[PDB]
Subunit: 312 residues, 3 copies
Amino acid sequence: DVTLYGTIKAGVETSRSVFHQNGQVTEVTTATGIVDLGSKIGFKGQEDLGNGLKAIWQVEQKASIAGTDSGWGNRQSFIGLKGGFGKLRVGRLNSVLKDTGDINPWDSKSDYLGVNKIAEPEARLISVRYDSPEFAGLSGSVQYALNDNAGRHNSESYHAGFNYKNGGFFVQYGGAYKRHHQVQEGLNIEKYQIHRLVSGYDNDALYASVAVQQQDAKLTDASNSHNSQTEVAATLAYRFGNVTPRVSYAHGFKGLVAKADIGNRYDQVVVGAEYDFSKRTSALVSAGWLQEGKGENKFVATAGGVGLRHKF
Amino acid sequence: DVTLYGTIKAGVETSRSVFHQNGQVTEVTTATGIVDLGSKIGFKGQEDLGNGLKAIWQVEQKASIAGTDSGWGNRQSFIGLKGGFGKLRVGRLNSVLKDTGDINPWDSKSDYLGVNKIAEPEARLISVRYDSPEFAGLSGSVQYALNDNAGRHNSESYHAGFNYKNGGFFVQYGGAYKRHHQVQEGLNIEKYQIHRLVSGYDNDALYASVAVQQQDAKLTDASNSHNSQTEVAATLAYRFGNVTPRVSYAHGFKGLVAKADIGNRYDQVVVGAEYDFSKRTSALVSAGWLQEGKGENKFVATAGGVGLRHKF
Amino acid sequence: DVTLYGTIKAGVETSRSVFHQNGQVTEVTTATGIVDLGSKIGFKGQEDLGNGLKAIWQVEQKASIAGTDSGWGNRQSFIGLKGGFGKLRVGRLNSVLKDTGDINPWDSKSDYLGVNKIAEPEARLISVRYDSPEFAGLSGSVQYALNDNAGRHNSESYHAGFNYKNGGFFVQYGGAYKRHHQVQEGLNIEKYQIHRLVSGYDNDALYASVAVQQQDAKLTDASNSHNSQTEVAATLAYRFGNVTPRVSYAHGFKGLVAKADIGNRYDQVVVGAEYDFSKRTSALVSAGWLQEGKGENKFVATAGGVGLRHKF
């Protein structure tokens, strides 16, 4: 069983970013560009080893149709075993966090055409992951990333999650703890933990999801100042034949973060539709609004885009 | 429909470059090396979407057998749609220019073993391209590359071309306009335009081609000095069973270019033969001469090479 | 004939390195990490050209499951022809040396979990290689790497080897000569030659091998000081059903090398077992000890590891 698979997706996006600083406009920048929406190519396989035991492997790469990427195995890549005991994998693996929701189902490159801000702590990392068998809707996962694989200024990290599925209803949890975390521009953070909870309903013609996410850590400053951030995101989609409109809203609460991201409070909505020419090929259109102000020092972004997506 | 394809081609080249500066020899350099002639590997597919409509995609990479290249999609890569209306593609795409002739059919790495100088403004770039259906020999193409995709010192660019084909006879035109163009070592240029016209006869046992190319631009110097260059290239090939000798001649007229390329006037001839072991596998041999002097400050290059090429 | 193939292999290794400097411990460092053991993906093909003649090609890349590698064709990649006359290849090719033994059959990333030190002069390089047909157990190889392909501070190099095989018994020889060789940190060397001889017995259930390796060169210092190094390695394996324990010992003699590698004298043993779930999938475990001291300034390393390997 050796399979070549991938997703090719690209389109065009335009956007406009406005800083109001109580004087109305202080800055206006625009952007209009053809962009890749995250095209990828992978190789994978499995082998039946008998007694229900299986070998599994995958080597998956970024393959932007812009021709900008390079690297083998820089997307999710692993080897492992799977059988009655569950599934054990090693390699460059999604964090449990990254697998908890499909919290950002938008194919977009602009940060205003998807629910990107809440998705940002998601990552792949070199680690070991155990995924349990499913028993009556319930499964779980534990994952560990060693201190040596993390680098000089990054500690080991612990990851856990559980999932429940019954019919179209689901709830997923995922969390992580990290002793030392490098922030590249600013002061680093310690005792970082993130927790995410998602619940919704998923099937044909009806998709709904709501997610809340909490991050906490201590700043490596003169006082070990606590930092925290809370974010919620909800999306709703409904399929009419070949067309599926969806809408997303996300909100970031005013949180104690040193970074100038920072996050300050934000609100965003993304709106759009997919048109399916087939089960593998879809056209995409979307539009988005984001405000990171208070009403006074507003940052207002608008954007729109169209795209094409093909799976194979 | 998911296809893996490619061209593997390599050989060995030797060359000798002589600067005469009215004293006869001022410099003599030589080069003898095993070289890759542009090996490549790609993935592509299409899907019938019904009503004669189709999804198309390709991800194509450099894959030198020297093992020097890296990158996904750094050759022609795209997604698009094709149907009765014609063909629309987006991604890293050949400029119309690059598709107008097969002006340099030589597989070579040395600049003296192919018609390389005239081919140099050819490129791939991130853009949108529309290719029309063919009606009684006639088709056309328009292509646009956005200012944001081009970089900070490069403007948007416009590309157009038309083709005519009837039996073995063809004529192809291709042009481009670019408001701002960065030249890396020298002063940048503005209002750059290039036009190329090619006509010839192509089939089994008889290939002939002649091409003329004109470039014009304004120099970003103290006076907006006009710059221009004109070049012609002709090649002739004839197949005797398994062997196909061909010869090329190219001439660059003495043109107003600031660059020390510059181009000054040049003449070159390339001579060679392909031997086909099969429809996919060919042996290659070639030899070349180039003079970039006036007769006084001559630069004289000679070269030879042998190679092997396999398509799959 | 177009084939996609590869080896995916990864596991976890722990090690501990101790410097004794007559005071007992001066330094103790440890390392525990998930690691890729040299995963790779390749494309290859051949075409029957008639009369027993064949075209052959391969493009093979590193593809670490850590996601750290990049490059096409950065493992063994070539094009060539094969027929009654033998086999002729061009491209990035194993040196004859690298093909003489399977002197280090350990999949390991730590230098203490394989016979790595003796294997270090092995390399791939851009070159031409001729491999003879086999006549009554005997074959040979000659290989040449041009001065231009080698770089500015590296000369051309000559490679030769012969092989004998009869039943499970083999003897292999491989050597190389290199006029100028750059050493990156230290003084460069000249008139470098390496010779390796390996003999052993190989089949089902019984593998034995012994190898001796000699290197000589002149140092580009004030006196053209001679430098030399001698190393021996032996390994023994026996298969019991699905399990195959093996052991290796290697010794480096006290040799005249300027480098602080340097090599000083060393002894090492590696011990381990492969468990085969199938002909393509194997679990691995190993442990290793190395001493680079004299008894006084000892460097003592221990290590252990477990891994999984799948071929396709």
